[PDB]
């Protein structure tokens, strides 16, 4: 047996985030 | 022979949410 | 022997920003 | 070794656009976000947007919107950012920075580039 | 936005005290466990240097005399003990919601 492998390519993208907050009510 | 190698490193952060649901008339 | 391959892609990153707050 | 080479300096008359740029080495460049930060000299600092390279994926800040313009050259490894019409409020130092791979702090910054708008 | 304001602007300590640095969000930074917080410390003429991540946690090559704690909308940076090499602005920044917001800063003076 001989060495290992080069390390793989970056990762994806991660999760897309949260959804922002529901805005306050108006005057 | 030998084994493949590690994991690549870890990936970019997500992107970002949608907006809010623009509150409300008052 | 020689070396094995290209290892596996790495993790997905971490989560995205909130999105903003919705207008008044 | 990660490296966010920008120039020490841009000047531009009051009105001529200014495209400032970033030149990426030591890791994926299509792999990352490029964000970029303003920062007036003896003040605080204000993140103006991020794109990714891959598929210039856009975020400006909704100050910035109508104000800077991110590309980027994937051949050279290389992220701009051009400000339109500038006034001497644009005068300041951008960085570009990158947040920590996996992570969500700013782990690497670029020195800066001075942008002086001047006659 | 949320808005991270510090305190004090300005903070006089003699070498070898406690220097403590505070930082109030307008709404929480917290998300899934985590604390979304990051301190920074900037010498002139150079970007900013980045002391903690997540509220907490030690950045490789920061001496332990930094550390920090909070969480929500109440978050400190604590230099102890203080050394001359310290002085410098120091900035909170919050990463959890879009866009990315810094504190005003607190510039760090020595007594001698």
């Known amino acids: 047996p001989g060495p290992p492998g080069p390390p793989g390519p970056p990762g994806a993208r991660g999760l897309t985030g949260r959804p922002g907050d529901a805005g306050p009510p108006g005057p | 022979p030998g084994p493949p190698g590690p994991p690549g490193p870890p990936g970019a952060r997500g992107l970002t949410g949608r907006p809010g649901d623009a509150g409300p008339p008052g | 022997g020689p070396p094995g391959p290209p290892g596996p892609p790495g993790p997905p990153g971490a989560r995205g920003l909130t999105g903003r707050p919705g207008d008044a | 070794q990660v490296q966010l080479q920008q120039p020490g300096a841009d000047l531009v008359r009051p009105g001529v656009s200014v495209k400032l740029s970033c030149k990426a080495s030591?890791?994926?460049?299509?792999?990352?976000?490029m964000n970029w930060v303003k920062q007036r000299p003896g003040q605080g600092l204000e993140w103006i947007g991020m794109?990714?390279?891959?598929?210039?994926?856009?975020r400006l800040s909704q100050k910035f919107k109508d104000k800077a313009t991110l590309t980027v050259d994937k051949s050279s490894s290389t992220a701009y950012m051009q400000l339109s019409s500038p006034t001497s409020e644009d005068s300041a130092v951008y960085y570009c920075?990158?947040?920590?791979?996996?992570?969500?702090?700013?782990?690497?910054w670029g020195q800066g580039t001075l942008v002086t708008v001047s006659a | 936005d949320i808005v991270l304001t510090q305190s004090p602007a300005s903070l006089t300590v003699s070498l070898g005290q406690r220097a403590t640095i505070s930082c109030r969000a307008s709404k929480s930074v917290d998300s899934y466990g985590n604390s979304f917080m990051e301190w920074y410390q900037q010498k002139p003429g150079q970007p900013p240097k980045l002391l903690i991540y997540?509220?907490?946690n030690l950045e490789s090559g920061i001496p332990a005399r930094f550390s920090g704690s909070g969480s929500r909308t109440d978050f400190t940076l604590t230099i102890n003990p203080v050394e001359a090499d310290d002085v410098a602005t120091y900035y909170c920044?919050?990463?959890?919601?879009?866009?990315?917001?810094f504190g005003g800063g607190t510039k760090l003076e020595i007594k001698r």
């Open positions: 794109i990714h390279p891959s598929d210039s994926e856009t």
């Open positions: 920044q919050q990463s959890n919601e879009d866009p990315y917001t």
């Open positions: 030591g890791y994926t460049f299509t792999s990352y976000w």
């Open positions: 920075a990158r947040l920590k791979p996996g992570g969500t702090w700013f782990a690497y």
């Open positions: 997540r509220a907490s």
